[PDB]
Design a protein around this ligand. Structure first.
Ligand SMILES: [Mg+2]
Ligand SMILES: [Mg+2]
Ligand SMILES: [Mg+2]
Ligand SMILES: [Mg+2]
Ligand SMILES: [Mg+2]
Ligand SMILES: [Mg+2]
Ligand SMILES: [Mg+2]
Ligand SMILES: [Mg+2]
Ligand SMILES: [Mg+2]
Ligand SMILES: [Mg+2]
Ligand SMILES: [Mg+2]
Ligand SMILES: [Mg+2]
Ligand SMILES: [Mg+2]
Ligand SMILES: [Mg+2]
Ligand SMILES: [Mg+2]
Ligand SMILES: [Mg+2]
Ligand SMILES: [Mg+2]
Ligand SMILES: [Mg+2]
Ligand SMILES: [Mg+2]
Ligand SMILES: [Mg+2]
Ligand SMILES: [Mg+2]
Ligand SMILES: [Mg+2]
Ligand SMILES: [Mg+2]
Ligand SMILES: [Mg+2]
Ligand SMILES: [Mg+2]
Ligand SMILES: [Mg+2]
Ligand SMILES: [Mg+2]
Ligand SMILES: [Mg+2]
Ligand SMILES: [Mg+2]
Ligand SMILES: [Mg+2]
Ligand SMILES: [Mg+2]
Ligand SMILES: [Mg+2]
Ligand SMILES: [Mg+2]
Ligand SMILES: [Mg+2]
Ligand SMILES: [Mg+2]
Ligand SMILES: [Mg+2]
Ligand SMILES: [Mg+2]
Ligand SMILES: [Mg+2]
Lengths: 146, 56, 100, 77, 124, 59, 22, 48
RNA sequence: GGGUGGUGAUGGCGUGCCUUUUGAAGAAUGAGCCUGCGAGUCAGGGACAUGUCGCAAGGUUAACCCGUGUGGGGUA
RNA sequence: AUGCCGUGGUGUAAAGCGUGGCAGUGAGACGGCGGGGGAUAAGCUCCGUACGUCGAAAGGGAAACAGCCCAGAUCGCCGGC
RNA sequence: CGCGGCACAUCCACCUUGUGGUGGGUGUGGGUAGGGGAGCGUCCCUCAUUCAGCGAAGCCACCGGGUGACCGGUGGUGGA
């Protein structure tokens, strides 16, 4: 019988990811993996493994100027002609944390469990986060050499 | 013995017109699918004696 | 201590006293079997070498021949009238491992 | 529309052509090449036929050859 | 010899409805609707008995790869390393010992690293 | 001298001559291997089914 | 004509090998 | 002694009768007729 | 701790059944549900082919006759 | 060039052939290659092709996706390639 | 491919060497129309045998079983 995690076997930690020069896609993949728990050998696709992820300095995620001008975020209200266009560039000015979180959410599996997964994600525009009551360990992006 | 659809009492008219009623077309009230209708391939009187040879 | 023991085209991690269900062996209830190992871990040591673990065998005691769950197959294809009904009970053996 | 079916007829295919090829053993009377005109000519031991059929007078092996430009079919016994 | 059908007929109906217990709506109440869902259920079960052999190995590889990159190796190269080292421990037990005995898993990573060629990227 | 032929691709979709040539070599399924003498007939067969097999001069 | 062209162009995928029904 | 219940037909003398149109596991719905035309419902005379 | 039985958070996979079609989950047909009923049968020294059994250069009777019967006669 | 006919070797179990019993089928589809018709249009139409697949073929790939690519499901496995 | 179960065809060796069994090979086992083969269940009759008011049939539940149709056991209900 292959191990299936119980209720209570999930130990959750807290990480802070600095987004100061990280390419937005790299950041989003790392956050999604870390917040799902793909990195821990106890992983099960039907379980909320995974840790809490605080992204800070979301304002300075690395997005190239061409994407800042041309990559468009699309939102349909459900009314006719209710397609609203924004640009990554202007969501960076208004809601940069929304840009980062939207990237994460797109990386997450499209299913009920991910609705609980994304509850463990905090994204902040500034360099400060209110979640210092824990001891959120910084997490840098690394690539395992092959 | 049983009674085929032609030997069952009645069943002469077409019970209703072929088209327009919204029902299955039927042809006769004594068709085998009807309860009280004729029996299809039912037992008929038979003689089961065989002609076994004398020396057998 | 435990070892990764190979039997029935499969392999299982067992520790002395473990009861394991395996493919059918031609051994009656009560007699010993010796089974090759793919790995032995004695705590902090593994030694993970084919020549080294060719000479160690997991010793097991056949507790009995059991029979797997009833699998009920009814192969069905959509608009053809095809139906195939089968059943199947896999024959298994239970071994209490006492070796390593 | 135009009734341009002015040309929609044809005759039956007559299954012409070589019926027994070189080096192939045949019995007497067996037709070797059925054809129109003398596309092949009767060689030794080969008869021609009323419709130019090139049969075998004798049993043996079919062989093809050239006889002064004329291409011929013969049987070697 | 007129034969009533019910005694023989009800046998397969009882079996189908018993197998259809737990189904919702008419699929657990009505033999005709339960039988259709039984054909689907047994087709699905047949499909998934041979699909779970890929499903569990997918899960084993996921766990193995997670443990491997805790020990700073990709699953890619850890599988080479075990092949070259001659370790024939399958991914069932590799994942299960990655969970139960992480130190033994680290030892296996060490032997796999050692068995890897020095330049894992040059032709052989 | 003595060729060693392993079937690596399916006969599904193969032409008559390829299927019958694999049959003639005696190849039955993927990673079946047969040993046959390296004569002209064998190399003609292998040429017909070249894309479906790999061969080696194995003793 | 867009639906037709897009359906026709999706043969040009590696898995299809330049070939596709209709 | 030989009784009425020691009595038995010769092997292969009594073959079973094929009951047509009795489900998919046997000669099923179309009963071997397979068809939608004349043969599906009638006989074609040998002279035709 | 372990095993039954019930339930099933959550993850994956997953286009009803029948008919009929090149092709239907099909937005083609039929079916609201259940129970009951509802379709290759029988006759004939028919015909062909087969399996089997009896007798065999023969085989077999039909009508009919006699028997409580399924038995015995009966050569046309 | 292929293809075809014959022939001699080699290979290949479920080749072939004759003669009986019982069939069904005789609406095909798409894809490759060669052509006609069409406007070298059509998911068009009509042929050819010891060409394929579907039909009657599940599994894997192609997002989904009969007809494309891989591969032909006797059953079981929480083994491997 | 590995390990285990089944089946079909065919081959080789022992047993009354074909009614054929046993062991072992080898190959094979997607399938519509359709062909062939072998079975499950219901009822009735005959023969034998065996249960049944200390409880048959039918039905219900549960536990088991067979490669399938399906089967058995136990209990409840019931009354021939
Ligand atoms: Mg009348
Ligand atoms: Mg009328
Ligand atoms: Mg009446
Ligand atoms: Mg008489
Ligand atoms: Mg169909
Ligand atoms: Mg002409
Ligand atoms: Mg004349
Ligand atoms: Mg349920
Ligand atoms: Mg697999
Ligand atoms: Mg039906
Ligand atoms: Mg027909
Ligand atoms: Mg038709
Ligand atoms: Mg019909
Ligand atoms: Mg059809
Ligand atoms: Mg149509
Ligand atoms: Mg409909
Ligand atoms: Mg609908
Ligand atoms: Mg219609
Ligand atoms: Mg309706
Ligand atoms: Mg016609
Ligand atoms: Mg036609
Ligand atoms: Mg055509
Ligand atoms: Mg063309
Ligand atoms: Mg067309
Ligand atoms: Mg074509
Ligand atoms: Mg398919
Ligand atoms: Mg597929
Ligand atoms: Mg898919
Ligand atoms: Mg691999
Ligand atoms: Mg089959
Ligand atoms: Mg197969
Ligand atoms: Mg059939
Ligand atoms: Mg009483
Ligand atoms: Mg009582
Ligand atoms: Mg009764
Ligand atoms: Mg019961
Ligand atoms: Mg009882
Ligand atoms: Mg009772």
């Amino acid at each position: 019988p292959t191990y299936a995690p119980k209720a209570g076997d999930t130990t959750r930690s807290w990480y802070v990811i600095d987004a100061t020069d990280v390419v937005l896609g790299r950041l989003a993949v790392a956050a999604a993996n870390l917040l799902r728990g793909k990195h821990k050998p106890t992983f099960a696709p039907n379980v909320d493994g995974g840790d809490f992820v605080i992204v800070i300095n979301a304002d300075k995620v690395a997005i190239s100027g061409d994407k800042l001008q041309h990559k468009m975020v699309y939102r349909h209200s459900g009314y006719p002609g209710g397609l609203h266009k924004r640009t990554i560039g202007e969501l960076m000015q208004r809601h940069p944390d929304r840009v980062v979180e939207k990237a994460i959410l797109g990386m997450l599996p499209k299913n009920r469990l991910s609705r609980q997964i994304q509850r463990k994600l905090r994204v902040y525009a500034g360099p400060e986060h209110p979640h210092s009551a824990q001891q959120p360990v910084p997490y840098e992006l690394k690539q395992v050499a092959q | 013995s049983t009674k085929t659809r032609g030997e069952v009492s009645g069943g002469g008219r077409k019970p209703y017109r072929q088209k327009g009623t919204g029902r299955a077309r039927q042809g006769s009230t004594r068709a085998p699918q009807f309860t009280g209708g004729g029996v299809v391939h039912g037992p008929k009187p038979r003689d089961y004696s065989q002609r076994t040879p004398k020396k057998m | 201590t435990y070892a990764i023991v190979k039997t029935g085209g499969k392999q299982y991690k067992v520790a002395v006293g473990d009861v394991v269900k395996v493919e059918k062996l031609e051994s009656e209830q009560g007699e010993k079997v010796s089974l090759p190992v793919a790995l032995v871990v004695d705590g902090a040591t593994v030694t993970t070498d084919a020549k080294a673990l060719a000479k160690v065998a997991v010793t097991g005691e056949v507790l009995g021949h059991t029979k797997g769950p009833k699998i009920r197959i009814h192969k069905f294809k959509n608009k053809t009238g095809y139906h195939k009904r089968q059943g199947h009970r896999q024959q298994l053996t239970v071994l209490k491992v006492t070796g390593i | 529309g135009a009734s341009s079916s002015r040309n929609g007829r044809d005759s039956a295919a007559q299954r012409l052509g070589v019926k027994r090829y070189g080096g192939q053993v045949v019995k007497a009377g067996e037709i070797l090449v059925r054809q129109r005109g003398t596309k092949f000519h009767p060689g030794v031991n080969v008869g021609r036929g009323g419709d130019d059929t090139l049969f075998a007078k004798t049993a043996g092996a079919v062989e093809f050859g050239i006889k002064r430009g004329r291409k011929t079919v013969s049987i070697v016994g | 010899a007129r034969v009533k059908r019910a005694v023989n007929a009800h046998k397969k109906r009882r079996s189908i409805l018993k197998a259809s217990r737990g189904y919702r709506g008419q699929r657990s109440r009505l033999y005709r609707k339960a039988k259709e869902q039984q054909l689907h259920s047994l087709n699905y079960a047949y499909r998934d008995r041979r699909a779970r052999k890929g499903e569990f190995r997918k899960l084993w590889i996921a766990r193995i790869n997670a443990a491997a990159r805790l020990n700073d190796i990709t699953y890619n190269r850890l599988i080479q390393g075990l092949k070259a080292a001659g370790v024939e421990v399958d991914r069932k037990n590799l994942a299960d010992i990655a969970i139960s005995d992480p130190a033994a898993f680290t030892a296996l990573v060490d032997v796999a690293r050692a068995a890897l060629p020095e330049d894992v990227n040059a032709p052989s | 001298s003595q060729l060693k032929i392993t079937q690596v691709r399916s006969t599904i979709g193969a032409r008559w001559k390829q299927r019958e040539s694999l049959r003639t070599l005696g190849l039955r399924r993927i990673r079946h291997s047969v040993i046959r003498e390296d004569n002209a007939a064998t190399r003609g067969l292998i040429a017909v089914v070249r894309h479906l097999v790999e061969v080696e001069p194995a003793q | 004509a867009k639906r037709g062209r897009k359906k026709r162009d999706r043969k040009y995928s590696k898995a299809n090998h330049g070939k596709r029904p209709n | 002694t030989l009784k009425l219940h020691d009595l038995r037909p010769a092997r292969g003398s009594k073959t079973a009768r094929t009951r047509v149109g009795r489900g998919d596991g046997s000669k099923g719905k179309t009963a071997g007729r397979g068809t939608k035309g004349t043969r599906a419902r009638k006989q074609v005379p040998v002279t035709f």
